[model samples]
Target: DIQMTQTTSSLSASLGDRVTITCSASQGINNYLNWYQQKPDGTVKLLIYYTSSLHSGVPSRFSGSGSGTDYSLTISNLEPEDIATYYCQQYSNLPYTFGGGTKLEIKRTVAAPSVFIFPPSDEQLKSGTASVVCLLNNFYPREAKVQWKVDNALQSGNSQESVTEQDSKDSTYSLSSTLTLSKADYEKHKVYACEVTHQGLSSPVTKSFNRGEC
Candidate 1:
């Protein structure tokens, strides 16, 4: 079976902006298509299935409308709660694949809010330190939390730092946390996790990273 990788050139979008993504199959895969959103440190949320059906609890503002071979996922009335990287995955064959993702930012023209995180260099090894950074624009309910874990086990010494947005009426904030361990940590190939939790949400979203060795 042929495998395909997707990518988005645009990095950020404003609220209510028509966010479009293109997914091409390596070879024809019929009409089997799916879309997902990967939260900072959490599980992938299924947005669209079978090319166009909106998942049960998803907001009406978020919708997927596309066809066979090439498709797109669109979010109409974007809100602060709706900011995240959107990805398209094809399930027509084995070894599923995903699009690079496009981050939706708060509408700068209006009162828009968004969040993002940058992980350490992918080349870093065990016994080395890695940094994780978080960014947010005009997030309501200001309280925020960031933490780190090893092999799913929460680690100590994790901390959160904050920053303010200068130009926009809304506030932009950021924080960083560092992880340190021995080479043994890399040998075991444990999954390092970073999680961000804030108000107005039920649970924290986490992202996981594993050693390059496979």
Candidate 2:
């Protein structure tokens, strides 16, 4: 288990506005540290910052200014429909802490999720007891989901996933989910599929898994 210096912040943006959302790090992160909050009306909204820009008719614009644990998060062509979460991970490829609780994703880094079955050879056809861990990584804005299906039928078991984690290499996330199998489950030529869903995908991303030659 990892403990993180989570600094949660609240944000709201109107069209063409540059804003700075603040936080403190009892620790460190940059999946780009994410910030979000629930509104009084019960809606969860994410924050956005522009790297640089030009907006007309604006009184003042951010030109770069900061000091003492404070920094500027920029956005130029802010739209009224803008919203997204954060992903602060490290080079270690996983997040040990939320800095506090949880957050997810990055816009540009967002892409189709890829999954791997740990040990892929959990089928103990002899022992009749089998299990496998599903790995989901490399997506942003923290919006990917996983569903398990065996031969096009609902395969029920369990899954565990961290809130969200940012990684250094291409911002692939460390957050994931897991699954276990049965002996009879894998005894045959089982057709297991790891179905995934997210904004980065046009439809669910499915990967098939079967007993591997161990």
Candidate 3:
């Protein structure tokens, strides 16, 4: 079976941006590549067929190029409607394999998030259970990873991500996560760390909460 490999798992492009998605085959498939677009609602559309031929009804902005084991799909100017997952498939082999898939999202200007860690207040901790909140502010691009660590070890519990909020004025994003623990557990681990990771950041932002500091 021939394998079509799309290295980039996802991409983000703003309106009017030129976008290109490349796919490579494990073995030369003799220009038998086909491109497809899958919408959020599961509607699939054929954009290109036979390596570089635009499919009927596909927009002129959509094009395909390359041959042999390499091929790419190019969008001259990205549009809002073009935000969808893309795939490449090869029909040359009997198996007719497909590339993993590429998700397309709207790109925003890069900005690092401001990290904040809130330890359980004295009043809140009196209830025997406490909630520690990790807040991220003014970050561009909605995707992020947040985790809690107790003295260098990953903490596993009822920690959960909160709702993501966007600022309409600047189109920036903000999100949060909560780490809940019982008073006994909180006392056991004097130090709590919240680590936030984003593509725009050079390194993850980690903030610590110390029981003594409170």
Best by TM-score: 3
lDDT (10s digit) by residue, model 3, range 47-120: 99998888888899999999889999999997667877899999988888989998876666788889999898
Q: Is candidate 1 or candidate 2 better by lDDT?
A: 1
Top candidate on lDDT is 3
The runs of at least 3 residues in candidate 1 whose Cα sits more than 4 Å from the true structure, single-residue gaps closed, are 109-171, 175-214
Candidate 1: the clashing residue pairs are 41-205, 41-206, 41-207, 42-206
Please give the distance, in angstroms, between residue 207's alpha carbon in candidate 2 and its true position after superposition: 0.9
Q: For model 2, what is the alpha-carbon lDDT of residue 118?
A: 55
* Candidate 3: count of backbone clashes, pairs at least 3 residues apart or interchain: 0
The lDDT per prediction is: 0.61, 0.48, 0.85
lDDT of 2 at 195: 83
Question: Worst 10-residue stretch by lDDT in candidate 1?
Answer: 165-174
| Candidate ranking (TM-score, best to worst) | 3, 1, 2
lDDT string for model 2 (78-166, tens) is 43233344322222235433333223222343566666765345335456656556666666656677787776886665555664434
